[PDB]
Design a protein around this nucleic acid. Sequence first.
RNA 1: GGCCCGGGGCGGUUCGAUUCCGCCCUGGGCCAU
Length: 437
Amino acid sequence: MKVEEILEKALELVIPDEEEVRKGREAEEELRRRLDELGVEYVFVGSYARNTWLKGSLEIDVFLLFPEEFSKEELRERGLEIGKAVLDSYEIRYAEHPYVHGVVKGVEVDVVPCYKLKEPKNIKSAVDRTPFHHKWLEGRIKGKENEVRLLKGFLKANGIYGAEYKVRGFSGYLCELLIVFYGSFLETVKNARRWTRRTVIDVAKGEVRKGEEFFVVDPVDEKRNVAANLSLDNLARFVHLCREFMEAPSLGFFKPKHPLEIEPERLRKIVEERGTAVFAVKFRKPDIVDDNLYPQLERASRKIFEFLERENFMPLRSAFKASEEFCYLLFECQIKEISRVFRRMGPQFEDERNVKKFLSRNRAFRPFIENGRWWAFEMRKFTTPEEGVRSYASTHWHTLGKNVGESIREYFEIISGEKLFKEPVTAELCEMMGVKD
RNA sequence: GGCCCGGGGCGGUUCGAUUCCGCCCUGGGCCAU
């Protein structure tokens, strides 16, 4: 029931069991055979090759080494060729460049093409660096794999384990580097409590210093930041999580938090107790990869939020959600309605020129002098958040992300009230408002 | 696709805009895959 003890039972949650490993070995086996009966120059990398793969997330990554001189196209053509001839099933996939995805003896496999190079510089694609990361990482991680797993388990369980844009957390490489630095999960957690947004971790120099931003410098590339895509808040959440784990160790930290739905009737009551405005902007999901959708949703949500605050509606928090069919931009505002008149600051009284122009615009309610300068009452074109957003989205759709914006321009609607709790956005909303229970 | 930095034109808004809201082309850097 204490630190160690818990970490004991925890392994049971993060370490792949015999049959899962056996499935993987036999798959690795076959794969190696097929690549040889064709005699290609390949190298297995990633967590499978270093036995740092988290339980239930088996996936083999085979990198195909190609001569420097080979043209970009040759790598991909031949890359696809090899993948097809060795994979039971094959489905081309994309990233920096196209690669191949499939299955062998029932396990996931990624066949990527890269340049067999020497020494970190000369790296052409990002994937060209992976081979190095593997070299640098294999000798050093040995005998600590289970540590890399506890860490991956911890993060994954609190939704901060991926480094892709839909998570902005810790990548698997970052995780090992951490273990290779602190020595184990417990040490990583223990020290993480003292981490700050100005913390720099230089693996290669075994040093920790103060920088301008959280920076884990790549053993292979001193300029590169491995935690480049880790959000300031996710950084913060982890530091807070580690502080709690040490405070009250628990096996719960390794268990995926239960979905915990809420009846739409309880949610309506809560919004009533909060007396706020709760609405969402719905639109068709652009058929694009997640790495493109979310950075866009984030922006879209940001722009409308910012429109909301300068517009005086006192937004409290924003939030977004994507489904197979639509995307929802959720908001909560302190102001359900606002007067139609508002005051506009004008020039200082002794500026005859500007004052004259200021008083030249005919308005309905006659400007006045207050504390040295002129003011005018003006009228709003809208008086509720929803009204304003309907106005904003219609005219600034183009500012919400290339794709998200093209979708909103063609179709969008604002939901709220009962009709909104029907939508598949209750968790995000509960998450947004800190609903607890 | 998104973020950062920087140029050249514009639009709207405003008494007043390089300085708010945005659109054109445009240069470098970074991120996820």
